[PDB]
């Protein structure tokens, strides 16, 4: 049976980077001519596994971890990266194995009015665990004065938004991203 890489890569709806999703791929035989033998991806960096020999490499599960970031925010999506997305939104382990495929989506994710639908977490006390997910809307404490979960002095709203406009150069257009996480019945 073919694998649903099509259902995640060509997903009509993409989740935001603060509220990404994981899908388990247990029982399937893949055809990696859909990933490697194509040119829709602008970022390509496979870690620990090569871009061709991965076909005859069995792994106990594969995860398709999909989201949207900004143009230069793709460089934060790498084990160890200290970037804003890497440290407060979604962190890769330093011993990560897998592939990352990212592509520009300005024509579907950037509107002239400003796209405020895609968001990210600018405020996250401490740092996330490898593959940890946080969707909490609990009001960010900016200082030690009590905020009773309210907005005012020393009291800030935790969540912010992107504003994807067509006027941005290559640096900061929207990008649809997929991170593949492998875990030691899937082959090519």
């Amino acid at each position, epitope marked *: 049976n073919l694998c649903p890489f099509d259902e995640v890569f060509n997903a009509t709806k993409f989740p935001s980077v603060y509220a990404w999703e994981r899908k388990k791929i247990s029982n399937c035989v893949a055809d990696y001519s859909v990933l490697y033998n194509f040119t829709p991806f602008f970022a390509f960096k496979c870690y620990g596994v090569s871009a061709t020999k991965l076909n005859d490499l069995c792994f106990s599960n594969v995860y398709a971890d999909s989201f949207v970031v900004k143009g*230069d925010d793709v460089s934060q999506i790498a084990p160890g990266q*200290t*970037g*804003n997305i890497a*440290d*407060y939104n979604y962190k890769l382990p330093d011993d990560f194995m897998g592939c990352v495929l990212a592509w520009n989506t300005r024509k579907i994710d950037a509107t002239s009015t400003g796209n405020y639908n895609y968001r990210y977490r*600018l*405020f*996250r*006390k*401490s*740092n996330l665990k490898p593959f940890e997910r946080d969707i909490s809307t609990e009001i*960010y*404490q*900016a*200082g*030690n*004065k009590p905020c009773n979960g309210v907005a005012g*002095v*020393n009291c*800030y*709203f935790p969540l*912010q*938004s992107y*504003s994807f*406009r067509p*006027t*941005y*150069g*290559v*640096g*900061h257009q929207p990008y649809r991203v997929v991170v593949l996480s492998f875990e030691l019945t899937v082959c090519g």
Partner: antibody, heavy 119, light 107 residues
């Protein structure tokens, strides 16, 4: 009221050490965006470093590994343990408060503290 | 570190004249340009957030435009109280940086 307190600037030799202090009023350090930007007397602004609400740090390669912006959670203070000082490091030091959304405007800095580096 | 170059480096404008400053980024940084005013013997004070919005506690005479790689502030009427320098700043990348700034005096 929002207010900032710079202090700890004093005369020093090249290669020395110095320390800044700010018992933070108007906000508290423990969970804010805070930068460090110095200005030389009669020159442009110079970005040095920035600590994030979770403790993330960024440095330019010209000032990398020399400056250590850090903070204990036990006190309401941004610390800067400064090492390997040079004559070009003469401030007029300012710590910045980052606001929310695309408004990352560092609106409130303070008055600055006088660090002079000379033989 | 992103290089932000401004022009011109200094200019003289009469009482009530119009001062307009330009600031260019070497890479695209959207509306990510915090614009400050530094009066002589005073810290820089924020004027613009988002490249086109007036900062809170600033006079309505300051209203800018430009986004991406080029940024503009038109002081619709420079005043005797506005005798000061201005500094653009980008924050679009992991290393932040400031523009050279334009020293503005009264003529």
């Amino acid at each position: 009221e929002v207010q900032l307190v710079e202090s700890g600037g004093n005369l020093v030799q090249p290669g020395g050490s110095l320390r800044l202090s700010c018992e933070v009023s108007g906000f508290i350090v423990s969970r804010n965006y805070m930068s460090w930007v110095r200005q030389a007397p009669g020159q442009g602004l110079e970005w040095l470093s920035i600590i994030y609400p979770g403790g993330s740090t960024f440095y330019a390669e010209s000032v990398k590994d020399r400056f250590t912006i850090s903070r204990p959670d036990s006190k309401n203070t941004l610390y800067l343990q400064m090492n390997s000082l040079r004559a070009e490091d003469t401030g007029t030091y300012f710590c910045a408060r980052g606001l929310l959304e695309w408004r990352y405007g560092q609106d409130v800095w303070g008055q600055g503290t006088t660090v002079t580096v000379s033989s | 570190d992103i290089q932000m170059t401004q022009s011109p480096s200094s200019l003289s404008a009469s009482v009530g004249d119009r001062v307009t400053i330009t600031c260019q980024a070497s890479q695209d940084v959207n509306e990510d340009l915090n614009w400050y005013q530094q009066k002589p013997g005073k810290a820089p004070k924020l004027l613009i957030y988002g490249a086109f919005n007036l900062e809170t506690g600033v006079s309505s005479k300051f209203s800018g435009s430009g986004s991406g790689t080029h940024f503009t502030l038109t002081i619709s009427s420079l005043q005797p109280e506005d005798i000061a320098t201005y500094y653009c700043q980008q924050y679009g990348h992991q290393a932040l940086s400031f523009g050279g700034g334009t020293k503005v005096e009264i003529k």
